[PDB]
Design a protein around this ligand. Structure first.
Ligand SMILES: CCCCCCCCCCCCCCCC(=O)O
Ligand SMILES: [Mg+2]
Ligand SMILES: [Zn+2]
Length: 630
């Protein structure tokens, strides 16, 4: 015949600087990276219509957000290497909204504030890994089928701003403040075995708190890892856990037996990840509806400055968006904030005060010079995948802000044969929060980070409906406005690596703490090595550590059984004295590990003060025995 689509699945490492960079999400000057729990990945899904095609690519990333700077550079790189294949119309980048990665990868000052500015090494790793994930995906194209399903996930999330949610007049089906809908797009190969999947479900990826310093992809990242590493059987499975409208949704409390909820953020991350995984796996297993039909897409950069909004989307009067403002730790420090001005002096312009409505302005970000602290030109994008439409929206939408847009788009698209509309927030840029008009009036946290005023949600609804109508009628969307390039003029106040020295009387790679003679399943092995600063080399597609199996004995050929990516391992870096440092590596030995002999290897990099040369360093522990059974 035969198969309606081809798809390609790819994954690549986008982990940034693992020590001494402010983390992105919690806005803390006292949350710097200090190691890795699990790495961050870009997971790319290339889809081609056999009829056609007509190729689309969707990439979900283990990041707090995908900033405009990343989107622009990724597109340029794709156009340079693969001319005519990819552009803004057929590439969607989205983020899981983990709050446990290194920051500094926006070009807008607001989002770099707590990080003390732009961190080029982390930015570059993100861009490069997103591109590598697409390269890997497109090199693995195969014929297959696509299925769609949905279901209700009850106990994974909770509304964190319920007072505002309840101000909406239209909350039937959302009376608990939760959007319980999970949607799954499954990728079924010519065998039809499940080759990969994308799950969409809204919940903040904040199980690892602002007290944590280890890099982690958080609860959605655990869901992906559990599917790829613990569950599939097949290689190489790619499972993305993506967001929808999560602006006002937090992980539910973890009240599983024997746990306080509070007691252990790793347990919480695993539990909330597992709750999402279990539902995604259930839905995929149902293969509810085969996806059939054309691939299509639209994309527009929209200038938000004085954007007119038609009365059909507002209270019934014509409206216009406001320039950006935030409503009501630097301190202290913050030299980057100081280089920006920093906070004050208002009163802001009267026109701004007036049209921001119930907001009490804390910072007038839109009027900052030479550059606004927040974006002004924002991407709006939609993919059609058979009877599915997937929307990529550049912000955090509350449940009702997203639901209203979904409803409006489904109404506009029904005649085109669309039956399911999936709203993917955190896509292509990041412009803070979107609350409905009613929520905005309450001015809880999400209101007050709704930058463009009370009609921000109405603007997005208009933009998406107009795009849906263009798709329906065939026909282009309006010409894109011109996304500002701020690459020239990025500031940074985060110091780098001066140099590394080994511990006095030792060499890089020397073992500081050897493992015990023997351990049992369930025990944690902790070892430590003289190291150098992880800012020297991200060890992209490699590792800071290996757990190595050498057999029952002997004497057997070494086989790596765990890397720094794995849930069961941790890598921690800490400064010792002026220029020395230690790498502490742990392994929690999981059920099912073979009894036998093991050791731990460390890989790192060190910088010479005099030459500035960066070299490879490393070491291996003595062996230890895991005791048990089979
Ligand atoms: C107000 C909207 C109409 C104006 C749009 C400007 C037309 C130029 C766009 C050309 C790019 C091709 C757009 C996709 C068209 C299609 O495939 O249906
Ligand atoms: Mg690990
Ligand atoms: Zn958020």
């Amino acid at each position: 015949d035969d198969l309606p689509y081809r798809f390609g699945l790819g994954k690549a490492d986008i982990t940034g600087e693992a020590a001494e960079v402010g983390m992105m999400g919690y806005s803390s000057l006292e949350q710097k990276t200090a190691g890795i729990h699990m790495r961050q990945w870009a997971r790319a899904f290339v889809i081609e219509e056999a009829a056609s095609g007509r190729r689309l690519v969707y990439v979900n990333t283990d990041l707090g957000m995908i900033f405009q700077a990343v989107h622009l550079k990724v597109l340029a790189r794709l156009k340079a290497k693969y001319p005519g294949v990819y552009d803004e119309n057929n590439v969607m980048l989205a983020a899981t909204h983990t709050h446990s990665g290194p920051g500094g990868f926006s070009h807008y000052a607001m989002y770099n504030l707590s990080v003390l500015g732009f961190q080029e090494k982390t930015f570059n790793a993100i861009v490069d890994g997103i591109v590598r994930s697409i390269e890997r995906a497109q090199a693995r194209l195969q014929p297959g089928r696509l299925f769609y399903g949905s279901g209700e996930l009850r106990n994974a999330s909770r509304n964190r701003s319920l007072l505002s949610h309840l101000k909406n007049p239209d909350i039937a089906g959302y009376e608990d403040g939760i959007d319980p809908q999970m949607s799954v797009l499954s990728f079924v190969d010519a065998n039809g075995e499940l080759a990969g999947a994308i799950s969409w479900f809204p919940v903040h990826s904040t199980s690892m708190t602002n007290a944590n310093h280890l890099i982690s992809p958080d609860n959605k990242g655990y869901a992906s890892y559990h599917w790829e590493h613990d569950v599939s059987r097949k290689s190489g499975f790619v499972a993305a856990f993506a967001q929808t409208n999560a602006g006002n949704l937090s992980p539910n409390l973890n009240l599983k037996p024997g746990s306080g909820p509070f007691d252990n953020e790793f347990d919480n991350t695993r539990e909330i990840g597992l709750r999402q995984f279990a539902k995604a796996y259930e839905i995929a297993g149902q293969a509810q509806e085969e996806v059939l039909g054309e691939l299509d897409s639209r994309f527009r950069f929209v200038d938000f400055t004085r954007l007119p909004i038609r009365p059909e989307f507002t209270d019934g009067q014509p409206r216009q968006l406001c320039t950006a403002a935030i409503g009501t730790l630097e301190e202290g420090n913050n030299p980057f904030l100081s280089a920006l001005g920093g906070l004050l002096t208002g009163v802001p312009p009267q026109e701004l005060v007036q049209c921001q409505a119930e907001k009490t302005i804390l910072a007038d970000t839109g009027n900052k010079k030479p550059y606004p602290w927040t974006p002004t030109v924002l991407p709006i994008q939609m993919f059609r995948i058979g009877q599915l439409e997937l929307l990529g929206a550049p912000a955090e939408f509350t449940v009702m802000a997203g639901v209203r847009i979904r409803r409006a788009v489904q109404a506009a698209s029904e005649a085109a044969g669309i039956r399911h509309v999936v709203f993917n927030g955190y896509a292509n840029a990041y412009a803070s929060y979107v609350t409905t008009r009613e929520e905005y009036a309450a001015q809880e946290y999400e209101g007050g980070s709704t930058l463009y005023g009370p009609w921000t949600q109405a603007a997005y609804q208009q933009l998406f409906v107009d795009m849906a109508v263009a798709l329906r009628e065939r026909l282009p969307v309006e010409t894109s406005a011109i996304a500002p390039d701020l690459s020239c003029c990025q500031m940074n106040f985060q110091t780098g690596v001066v140099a590394d020295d080994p511990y006095i009387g030792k060499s890089f790679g020397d073992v500081l703490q050897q493992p015990r003679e023997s351990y049992r399943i369930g025990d944690k092995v902790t070892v430590a090595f003289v190291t150098g600063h992880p800012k020297n080399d991200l060890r992209t597609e490699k590792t800071f550590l290996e757990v190595v199996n050498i057999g029952k004995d002997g004497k057997q050929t070494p086989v790596t059984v765990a890397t720094d990516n794995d849930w069961d391992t941790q890598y921690r870096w800490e400064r010792v004295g002026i220029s020395a440092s230690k790498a502490t590596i742990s392994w929690s030995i999981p059920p099912g590990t073979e009894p036998g002999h093991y050791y731990i290897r460390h890989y790192g990099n060190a910088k010479n003060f005099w030459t500035q040369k960066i070299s490879e360093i490393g070491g291996s522990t003595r062996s230890f025995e895991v005791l048990g059974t089979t």
